[PDB]
Write a protein that binds this ligand. Structure first.
Ligand SMILES: Cc1cc2nc3c(=O)[nH]c(=O)nc-3n(C[C@H](O)[C@H](O)[C@H](O)COP(=O)(O)O)c2cc1C
Ligand code: SF4
Lengths: 432, 62, 129
């Protein structure tokens, strides 16, 4: 068999079945859809069995880095010393174009809470701190209420699910910072400091929050793990190509008729995703210009690549981009493609933490140059200068925010160079 | 008190962000005397609260 | 090996009488042999590699006409560079100069750990980055 075509996920194979909040999000409704079912049996299997299901499912981090979750969660499966261990759920979701983690929190809070317990059990963690951006004040409150219902029901807290395992789930609100979504910068924010990433090593599995073994995992990665244990790793691994398994939450925004969050199979064609769910590109497929396929951090691709690209980690890598958060942004032919990307570099210049030189000075530099390419106020040689600057930033910074400031620039220079050189021509003839 | 008991003993400083935001919710904005007070309660140097206050954008210093 | 017919000399080498130096600046001068200390304003350690020989500082006064700094010490600006403490001492002895030697100072190896900044229960935990 090995279905070589993907998509058309059936409503019975969807995990986040309350994505649209048309069913009750509280505990009573959640249990009616499968949540908190046989959780005691899962916990009594143990961490080795749980980590077995995560590995077999081929689940990969949904936070944008896309690492193998099963291998990542296994660094915490080591004998303890004097320190406690923690699970940090990353609910920051600051990436432009991304809004999937918001839905999970306010429409399926109990899936996240059960993921924390199951995931925390696998890693030997004594508690889970859920870090949710400060702007999501109503979504955090919903989660805080669901946390109360779980406490009162014996599902978490002392003797969680009756399994003799003690677990805590804390909610901590951010205070406004896209950089706190970075795993180490999140930890420093929980500890009460500025959200500035740490250098690695040490790795959070060895030295994390409060100086203790920690694993930082995305909201979506945690939220699906209990289902993978109930339904098995093999079921999850039955979707998508090889090394690209599972369902995936997609946001489709920008210039589509029906912007929407939606669940769909991994490795579905990008066109099929946009057309069937989002209602097509505004003004028809032939009005398409370029798509940012995974939030601002990833390079944009043109209409030619968009014809036959699949939405998975490896298919987009060979397109010179990345799946990222899978936040598809569509830009139609009326968009000022230079001005769209200039506003992204302005976003990064506003988010850089300032800690390390290449991004503190470089991204601010690329912002000034892009501001001029929008007006055409430059000469063509500055395009290759901007390319070189972006390479001096990439791979030289402390964290990946620097890399994600460069890739938008490299995408624009890679595919729309004539657009840049064309706009420089007009400014010259007008002023000379 | 409930906020501070969310963190290990010996790591009260982790309450700087929530407690500092609680000052803003009570008062609407963070005057210098509000940050000086959160420094007293959590017993962290005031300069470490000024760093937090100016780093994050959800805090209003005017 | 050698064809020229050598000779034996057991006397210690001294050249004070053929150097041409005045008597005053041989007998009454104290030569300092040291490795210069690192300039504390900078971090480079390239100027702490060689041994130096310098003499004692002497009177510098103000020139009555323009206020410039006058001197009467011919050896005020003389500085010699040596590879080893033994070469420097060897040079001074054959020139008859009294000298001090100061042992080279070397920063001891430090134990640097990035992970210490985030210790669970130690005082090395940093309050800022
Ligand atoms: C600037 C920056 C922002 C990030 N923001 C998020 C985020 O909002 N949510 C998230 O899950 N991961 C974010 N990440 C990725 C995290 O560092 C980390 O890879 C992720 O929390 C791991 O989750 P996962 O393994 O479950 O995918 C960000 C990374 C960087 C460099
Ligand atoms: S790359 Fe930017 S955001 Fe990341 S540590 Fe360096 S300055 Fe801070």
């Amino acid at each position: 068999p090995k279905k070589t075509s993907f998509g058309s996920l059936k409503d019975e194979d969807r995990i986040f079945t309350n994505l649209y909040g048309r069913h009750d999000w509280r505990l009573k409704g959640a249990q009616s859809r499968g949540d908190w079912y046989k959780t005691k049996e899962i916990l009594l299997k143990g961490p080795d069995w749980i980590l077995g299901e995560v590995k077999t499912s081929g689940l990969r981090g949904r936070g944008g880095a896309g690492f193998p979750t099963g291998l990542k969660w296994s660094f915490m499966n080591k004998p303890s010393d004097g320190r406690p261990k923690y699970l940090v759920v990353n609910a920051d979701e600051g990436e432009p174009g991304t809004c999937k983690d918001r839905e999970i929190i306010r429409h399926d809070p109990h899936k996240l809470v059960e993921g924390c317990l199951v995931g925390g059990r696998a890693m030997g963690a004594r508690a889970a701190y859920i870090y949710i951006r400060g702007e999501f004040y109503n979504e955090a409150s919903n989660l805080q209420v669901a946390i109360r219902e779980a406490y009162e029901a014996g599902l978490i807290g002392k003797n969680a699910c009756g399994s003799g395992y003690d677990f805590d789930v804390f909610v901590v609100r951010g205070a406004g910072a896209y950089i706190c979504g970075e795993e180490t910068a999140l930890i420093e924010s929980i500890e009460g400091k500025q959200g500035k990433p740490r250098l690695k090593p040490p790795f959070p599995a060895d030295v994390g929050v409060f100086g203790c073994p920690t694993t930082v995992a995305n909201v979506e990665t945690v939220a699906v793990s209990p289902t993978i244990c109930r339904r098995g790793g093999a079921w999850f691994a039955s979707f998508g190509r090889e090394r690209n398994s599972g369902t995936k939450l997609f946001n489709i925004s920008g210039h589509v008729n029906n912007p929407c969050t939606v669940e769909e199979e991994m490795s579905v064609p990008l066109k099929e995703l946009i057309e069937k769910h989002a209602g097509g590109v505004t003004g028809g497929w032939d009005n398409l210009l370029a798509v940012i396929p995974g939030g601002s951090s990833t390079p944009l691709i043109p209409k030619s690549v968009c014809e036959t690209v699949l939405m998975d980690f490896d298919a987009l890598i060979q397109a010179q981009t990345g799946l990222g958060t899978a936040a598809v942004i569509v830009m139609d032919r009326s968009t000022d493609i230079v001005k769209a990307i200039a506003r992204l570099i302005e976003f990064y210049k506003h988010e850089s933490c300032g800690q390390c030189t290449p991004c503190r000075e470089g991204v601010d530099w690329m912002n000034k140059v892009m501001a001029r390419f929008v007006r055409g106020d430059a000469r063509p040689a500055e395009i290759d200068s901007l390319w070189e600057i972006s390479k001096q930033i990439e791979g030289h910074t402390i964290c990946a925010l620097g890399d994600g400031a460069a890739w938008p620039v490299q995408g624009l220079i890679r595919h729309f160079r004539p657009e840049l050189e064309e706009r420089m021509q007009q400014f010259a003839q007008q002023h000379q | 008190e409930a906020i501070v008991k969310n963190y290990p003993e010996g790591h009260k400083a982790a309450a700087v962000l929530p407690v500092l935001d609680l000052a803003q919710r009570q008062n609407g904005w963070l005057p210098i005397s509000a940050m000086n007070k959160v420094a007293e309660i959590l017993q962290v140097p005031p300069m470490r609260v000024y760093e937090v206050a100016t780093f994050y954008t959800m805090y209003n210093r005017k | 090996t050698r064809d020229t017919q050598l000779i034996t000399v057991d006397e210690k080498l001294d050249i004070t009488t053929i150097t041409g130096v005045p008597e005053e600046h041989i007998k009454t001068r104290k030569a300092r042999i040291f490795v210069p200390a690192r300039n504390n304003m900078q971090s480079g350690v390239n100027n702490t590699k060689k041994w130096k020989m310098e003499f004692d500082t002497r009177e510098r006064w103000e020139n009555p006409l323009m206020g410039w700094a006058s001197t009467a010490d011919p050896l005020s600006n003389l500085v010699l560079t040596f590879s080893t403490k033994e070469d420097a001492v060897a040079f001074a002895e054959k020139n008859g100069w009294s000298y001090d030697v100061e042992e080279r100072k070397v920063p001891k190896p430090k134990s640097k750990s990035y992970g210490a900044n985030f210790s669970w229960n130690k005082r090395t935990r940093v309050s800022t980055k």
